[PDB]
Design a protein around this ligand. Structure first.
Ligand code: NA
Lengths: 104, 103
C-alpha cells in the first residue's frame, strides 16, 4: 500500500488531544517525499482579516490560509492526509506574500 | 526599558540540551514587532552536508542554518535574545535556498 505524499498546492489535514487542523503544502513533491517533511501554511475557518491572510474559495464552506505563518512540519510521522488542492491562483497569492515578508 | 525586537538577518537565541537553539530571523522588524512573531530558520553546530544547509562563518567557530526548516515562532512569549547578525551574503544565501524550495 502506498502512502499519500503531499504535493505542492495540496491542502492537507494533520495534527498540531485532538490538535489536528488543515494546511497547504508549499514544498515540491520530491522534497516532501525524501525528508518526510514539507513547508506549509495553516488554514482556518476563522478570518480576523490580517494582511497576510489568503482567502480560500471552496465549494461548500470557505476559509483562510495564513501566509505569514509558513512552517516546516513532518507530515509523514504526523499522519497528513489530503483534503483537496488549491487553485494555482490561491497558491500564487500565498507565495507572493511570503515573498513580500522575505522575497528574493 | 524596551525589549529587543528581532530584525531581518539577526541571529537570536530561543527555546524550541543544545539550548533549544539559535535561529536566523528572516522577518522584517515591523512584522516581528507588531505581531510578536517572526519567521526564522534554526541553526546547529552539527552538519550533515545537506542541500539546504547554509554555512554561517563565525570568528571563533562555524555553524549552519537550515533553510528548508523555516518556521513561524512566537518570540516575545518564547523569549528571544540577540546573539549577533549574519552577513549580508549569508542571509541572502538563505533566502535563495528558500525560494529554491518554493517557487
Ligand atoms: Na524582563
Amino acid at each position: 500500500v502506498s502512502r499519500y505524499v503531499p504535493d505542492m498546492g495540496d491542502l492537507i489535514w494533520v495534527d498540531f488531544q485532538a490538535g489536528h487542523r488543515p494546511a497547504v503544502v508549499l514544498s515540491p513533491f520530491m522534497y516532501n517525499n525524501k525528508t518526510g517533511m514539507c513547508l506549509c501554511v495553516p488554514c482556518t475557518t476563522q478570518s480576523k482579516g490580517y494582511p497576510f491572510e489568503v482567502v480560500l474559495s471552496g465549494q461548500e464552506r470557505d476559509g483562510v490560509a495564513l501566509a505569514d505563518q509558513v512552517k516546516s512540519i513532518a507530515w509523514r510521522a504526523r499522519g497528513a492526509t489530503k483534503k483537496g488542492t488549491v487553485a494555482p491562483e490561491e497558491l500564487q497569492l500565498i507565495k507572493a506574500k511570503i515573498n513580500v515578508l522575505i522575497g528574493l
